[PDB]
Symmetry: D2
Subunit: 297 residues, 4 copies
């Protein structure tokens, strides 16, 4: 069986026909900053091109979205006036296929589970540390979406009550402590000049004591948050991706692993694995979402 | 379809035939002190008695137990003498001639509140019980989340305060170690410099003792925070809170807890938080539902 | 017995002749951007001008500044160059009079102690919440220097292990939690756009939940850090100054006071007073630093 | 110049004549468990015996005692100890808190001898301290000065005997160690058993002990920002008699929390059990002078 995956990012759209194991085509175009109708047009035409290049029509479309979904309306809750856009209904009109929405982090989690670092497991938990912190939970490989589409909001577990303000409206969230933007927040504040993650990591590798303190602290919060999530979910394996975590200095991964292990004393520790699928994970998980929906429907 | 539920406690064994919605019988007997073999006989006998009293035989048995379970091996890995690493499942199956399905007592109460109690009508729910310890259970459509290794839904051991007080699990700052019955008694006894149990602590609270208020309200807020945090992971239909320590706490406790839960869901859709409805029978009901849904699902 | 007070700030320089109770003159001039040489010159110039304007000469000079300072050597270790300037010696050669150096936050503390909110006390604790958080300890009533001149660095007590990184090299310091720039750091992060303290306070007053959460948190950390310092010092009174604290929305002062009171349950709470001396405290304290040095 | 020092403890009373250099006599009598006026007799008794065994009279008496004190009244419970003892003995009396007195002793005679200022922390059953600035105890406006055990290190932390939570004492004192160990091991565990488990490599015991050690290091490093003392002195049987990993973890935390700062030396207390008596004596001796 064949489907089409779409990954709607903030900068680019990716599309590809997927046969259950592999992408038979891959199309990347920029994401329209011109509004909803044009976003939808570019999605439909990326799908069409992907199908043309694979020489194969998809029987369904999986759409990965860089926002939280309303699966009932079929709407997305840096892309102009996508908000409240009836993206599912529109794409289903244009395309004549069912459209299955998924959150981008849940999609990447689904991809690693079936095709990446957790292949072989029945359940897995995925965290991505990038600009923000997101993740997903796969339980017998389907995404846990929640009653309201808020399931798997792993960057917003509270790790430090009385901690730094979070974008979500709370404080001391994992994202507020350890995301790329939190790292830049704290670096810029502590060094009293704009410091981006690149500069922070440069400083870290040169042995700057302030940079070390800050980076290691963030690494340990991730390890703590993952160990804590093990008590909730007890996943076969834990997968960590996202460019901020994967490209971090080696001291980072060491500290994170160390904290995870310390916060599993007295417990059975799942293996913690690096994400394998890189930038294609969202596209693969969007396609898998459609694929598995068809398969189980 | 009929099954038999069994709830194995430190003091008492409960048993009853269950029809998918209601108990058809209810038998309560003391839990033996004489070790695993006698406990296993008491369980089988209580089962048979429940079946005689209901006039019906169950086709499976569900058994709820406090301990850490090995679901793999069907063994109980506390207040019950040399049930240690005891292979209850096979022994019970052999005695009874029925398949036996094991479940942790907190997971069992959670299943029961989901199907028969505070969360009836939901697809998913999340249950926390505050008693001597803190436990819980996660129900997603209509079945307990057990985890790859049976550690799923260990809701009392999420880390809420790094550098907090030592927990019995081997960590520190766990919800249990902050807010359980024994945690309150630990901190009240230290701070008052004399033995203070939860009864004396709650009297002091109701009398307006400043130190008692401080300690109780802080524990109430950690429960609110831990439940709000769990909503981000699970996004359950409803959150259910039970256990004797939370349910019988002063009214200021419940207010402070609810206020913390609402504050830690600013920016979020807050599931309803509801008092557990089933009381002392939740464990028996969930043990029965365990077997019922397995047989139904089988 | 007269002295001259000098307050060296980044934008302006204040000078004034001080008789022990009162300023007999007050001069404000801009702070030169040309480098140490000219700064020292402008300082000496404002000194004489104030002496003329008051119609009397001081037998000593007090100089207050925000720099990291070396008190034994009289060197300033936001003004253009300046790195390790021997201001004390240079001012002494150029002036005739002995020169005494004080940290600006210490000076403001001394002034509030002798002339301000803590007048009448033998000991007080002073905290100033501005862009950063500074402090001063007055026992009675002389500034606690410290053996290394690190005494009274009240913005750097650790309140939250594992908290936000501080400019000092630590984390979870009072300053890192509650200073103006820490407010701007968290507001800018959480709102995902540049938010300065003016905008944060505007949002706070319009009832924005995120702004309320963040500002009240910073308020409570101030109340906690002050209550905690009480255990160490048992000051006659605690004095809170700085425009970020004194000019914050109604709601902020009330949360801060409540946290202070909550963290002194079971204790005798010193009064927590609002600084009285405003923009002149640094000048008055520089004057008092010289005044009290002379008279002992 | 010669004074008498007295160290009123729970179990026992210590007394000794002091000449500004050393003790010339030392008596240890049990404290009257029953009656407050009998304790007052026993203090003058022990003072006389001390002066008998020394063969010298003291010009002043210094009295160290565990409770928080009222230095205007001269009372502790709420008993006119200063006035009585002045009447009963015929010498001026000077009161001091026990931990302050130990701080003063370590400053003039022990680990910090030679400093202008020092900071002392005693980790025992509770956590107490004293601040010494040149050469005298910081008493505070209300006699509450130097209550170092009650600095807030962990908001939302464990309830404290003082009425707060997350105080250094509530995190790291002897009773705090026994509180957490007894809870986590689910059986009575005193500091001896806890330290035995630590040395045996029990993971739970290591976690709990190292945490308390680090909190002491952070609290001392934080007090350095307020006081900038010449040296920091750590004593008490719980700190002094702890396993070696305890001291290393503490120092490491103290050091990490003074990154970017000049760290004062941290020194072990030298005077052991005589600190209190020696500091009571110094309290009298220094007040005379
Ligand atoms: Zn958040
Ligand atoms: Zn635990
Ligand atoms: Zn700092
Ligand atoms: Zn305390």
């Amino acid at each position: 069986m064949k489907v089409v995956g779409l990954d709607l990012g903030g900068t680019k759209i990716a599309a590809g026909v997927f046969d259950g194991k592999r992408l038979l085509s891959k199309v990347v175009v920029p994401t329209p900053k011109e509004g909803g109708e044009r976003v939808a047009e570019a999605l439909a035409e990326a799908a069409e091109r992907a199908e043309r290049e694979a020489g194969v029509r998809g029987e369904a479309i999986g759409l990965g979205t860089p926002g939280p979904l309303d699966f009932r309306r079929g709407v997305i809750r840096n892309i102009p006036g996508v908000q409240d856009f009836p993206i599912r209904r529109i794409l289903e009109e244009a395309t004549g296929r069912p459209v299955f929405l998924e959150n981008d982090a849940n999609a990447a989690a689904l991809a690693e589970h079936h095709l990446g670092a957790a292949q072989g497991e029945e359940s897995s938990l995925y965290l991505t540390v990038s600009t923000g912190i997101g993740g997903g939970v796969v339980l017998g490989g389907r995404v846990l979406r929640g009653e309201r589409g808020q399931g798997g909001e792993l960057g917003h577990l509270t790790l430090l009550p009385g901690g730094p303000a979070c974008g979500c409206g709370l404080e001391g969230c994992l994202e507020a402590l350890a995301a790329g933007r939190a790292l830049e927040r704290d670096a810029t504040y502590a060094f009293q000049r704009p410091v981006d993650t690149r500069e922070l990591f440069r400083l870290f590798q040169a042995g700057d004591p302030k940079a070390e303190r800050l980076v290691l602290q963030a690494a340990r919060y991730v390890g703590i948050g993952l160990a804590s999530l093990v008590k909730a979910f007890d996943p076969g394996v834990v997968v960590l991706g996202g460019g901020v975590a994967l490209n971090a200095p080696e001291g980072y991964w060491e500290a994170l692993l160390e904290a995870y292990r310390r916060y599993l004393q007295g417990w059975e520790a799942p293996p913690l694995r690096r994400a394998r699928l890189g930038a294609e994970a969202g596209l693969l998980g969007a396609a898998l979402t459609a694929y598995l929906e068809v398969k189980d429907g």
